[PDB]
Amino acid sequence: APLLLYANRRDLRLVDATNGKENATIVVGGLEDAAAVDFVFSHGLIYWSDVSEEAIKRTEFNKTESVQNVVVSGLLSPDGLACDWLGEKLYWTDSETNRIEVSNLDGSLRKVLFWQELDQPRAIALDPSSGFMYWTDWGEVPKIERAGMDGSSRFIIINSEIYWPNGLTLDYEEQKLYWADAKLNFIHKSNLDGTNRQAVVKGSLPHPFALTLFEDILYWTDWSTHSILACNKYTGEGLREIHSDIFSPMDIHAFSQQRQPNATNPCGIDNGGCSHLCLMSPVKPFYQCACPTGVKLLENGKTCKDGATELLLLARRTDLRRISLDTPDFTDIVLQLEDIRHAIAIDYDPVEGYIYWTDDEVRAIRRSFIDGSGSQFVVTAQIAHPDGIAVDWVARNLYWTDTGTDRIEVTRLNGTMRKILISEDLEEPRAIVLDPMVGYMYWTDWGEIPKIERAALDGSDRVVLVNTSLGWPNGLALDYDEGKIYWGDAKTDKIEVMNTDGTGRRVLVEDKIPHIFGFTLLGDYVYWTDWQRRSIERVHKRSAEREVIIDQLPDLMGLKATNVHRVIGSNPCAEENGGCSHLCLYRPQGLRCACPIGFELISDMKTCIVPEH
């Protein structure tokens, strides 16, 4: 008796098609919006996606009342899910992030496989013995595609007479593909490459959602009739309702070991020699090593690097995100952080791996590791509108600008030993960057007389570098190797570059930059966020070739690109804080020790003391 497993929003249920009139048994309850379902029969596992909890979860069918979270981040509308029972992998689609992703069965080693030309991806079906995956897309260009389960050889197999392709399944016995179209009111079948397409049933399908198969019978769920229907897989005859009055039928499978035929795993017993993911592949040797999202596979084709070498770090008002710069997909991963209300400026310390960011609603400077763990408050008093922040990775100090207080201030990196460095002639201070090797800080002011200014790292010898043809200089970035500084101006709508002494000024970008805010340089590239275009973009600093990194993301703010671990440059503050009891503030002419309020330097020029009454 073919058992049918289906998702039902608040629960997952099992019904036997033989006695379909009977009450369906509840497999898992307490769910919110369970949508996609699949299983690993040999492992006794049932998986489901929940689109309100934004999670994929699993349970063991034998035991009871133990729901295991598998994927709980990075999901918005995970509408389709498929288990690779041969290679032991999990695949899913997401129609809001526009991605197809793969992971191990426990959710580890997640990798985004496809991120382009996905609009409303939905159903996904696997042929692990042939290394091919199939999925539907009911979006602007509706289609059925096929690709390697390693992400290779992507091909459109059906692109005509298609509109809402909601359901998709495979017949492993006859090597056939079946799908249901909820607009064109039919179920069709074809070979695995799309050829010899044939109509199975036509007209009795108000709103089919998911389709499955067992022996010579197709089974599908229908959103408008709230039921599971069935017909003969060759002729469409004998159409009938198996099970009715279902609250909200979603994905469905024939729950059987025979629907997951056993074959040799090409990965063997050594995971193919792959350090991380061993994915089924449709070409000899029929596996392919892969790496987590953003991570490069080395030359041997087997061993992953240790994480991304370079990251783009984003503040985005209500969250922070990181994007690897190592791979072409530019997947933004949201950091797991608490109480992010209005994050604005961001920087990063590669020595300890701390991101630092400002927030003018929390009114605090905070830091964390690149995944959101280790999160700590750094500065909480007299924070008002801190629109710029910079890490001094050499002297281990933290700088910020605040247009709510009209100051530039410095602390140690953990927020202690605070000193006001600039407290006059700041109207709208914003971006701030540091050159510890040379002894300078630079900052922008977008007030009524806009400026780019320079001072020593103690705020002394203040000088205006640029005060003409500026308006809203929001972004600032040094090119340490080339002796240049770049800026983005949201009023003149320009990205400009000049030597750090103010010579050689010239316009780099002039078009389609209506409102830069975030702004950073790494290697050959300048990156920015644009408040009006709602995009992250970059330009090659010599060729001026532009690339869109992310489009249509609201609430973009500050941006910093960085090597994750490597730092360059030094000065005498790096050695025992210069001997300074409190702050060591380097200048081109030599370091100056400094003190928080109420302390004074004594005659050794190093030690701060509260002076006697």
Add this chain to the structure above:
Amino acid sequence: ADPDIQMTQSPSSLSASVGDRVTITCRASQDVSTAVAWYQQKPGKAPKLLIYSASFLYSGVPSRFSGSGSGTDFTLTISSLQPEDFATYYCQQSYTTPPTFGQGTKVEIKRTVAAPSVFIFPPSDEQLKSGTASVVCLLNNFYPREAKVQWKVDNALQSGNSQESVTEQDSKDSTYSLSSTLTLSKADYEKHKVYACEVTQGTTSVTKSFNRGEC
């Protein structure tokens, strides 16, 4: 047949000052997850969506509106009430068919007391020719809404022959206006001389009158 999901709002009406925080509750008779929407309905206008999915602010809606809750208990909060927020507010579950609505919460704006300007209008001669006479008393731009309007005809208090109507709260100055209409046969109107509208709020009484014998 399955029971309709009952949405129970509270309070049925409330009055709060400009700047107050206002909270409205909505309880569902079945667990509806976060599938709850809130609407604002100004008088004589279609409902406008404020919140969906229990807490998501709909595009264009001011940020003083917010929502929260899950399961069966939901709330709508107006964090700083504005004079233009006079309206009836409805919750609705969007979880299953049929969509069902709460009975609504009428929000009134509390303001300082304002005494009415009172006016009395005799029937027109053109109406008098038709066998019926309408006498109208107008209470203009006053607060609070509650007022006692009594008709006196030759110093005899009238009973059973008048009806009142009240405008909606003014979206600018939060006052009301009220009309009271006294209806008489032509013969009865011509039987008496003095027509008076007495208006009382608290210890404050004002009377406007006309005499048929004027002119």
Add this chain to the structure above:
Amino acid sequence: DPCTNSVNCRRAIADSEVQLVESGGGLVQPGGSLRLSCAASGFTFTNSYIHWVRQAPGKGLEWVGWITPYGGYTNYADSVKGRFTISADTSKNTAYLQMNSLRAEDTAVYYCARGSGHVNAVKNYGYVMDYWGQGTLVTVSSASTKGPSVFPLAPSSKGTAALGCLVKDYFPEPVTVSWNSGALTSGVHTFPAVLQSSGLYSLSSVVTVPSSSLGTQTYICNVNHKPSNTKVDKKVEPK
């Protein structure tokens, strides 16, 4: 504009149009029939739920039914089942509510409303009604149409003076009133209609003006009772 570039000011500012136009309402005797239309524009008709929702006078909101125009599928409230039929014409982007065997308790303003989101989406907001038409009034009554008589409320010899128009003895609702063809709006109060024991409605519209203008300015109430094709322009003068 400096506010443009401020994190705090940009936030405080934030802190092709979809349209649904109903027609068809009016007075109908019990047992009779009426067809309402809802003309949609500004969105892909067939990707949406289209709802009908009704509101009896002084009462709350009651869902009537919906259609998904992509395939014409419908749902209905038990209170209208079998008597009301919803349909749609994709070529005209119009939905319809055919109302048969009408009952007195079907009297209501009838709104059509668009469900939010896409009809084929997994995260389905189709019962969230994100745009509502203006409504059309259906009155089910055996009483016949009657247009109003309009009488002056004359300014007294008494500063600020009050004047107005009394709009008496009409059926069904509604009446609209304007002053000086819409040129006079400040200080106007048009009261809700009251149902008189005769079964006919009456209302007054008033306006306060400076008492100096009583000799120099002319004041005209413009009364329209569309149900009876009765339009009246009444001059209000001191007596």
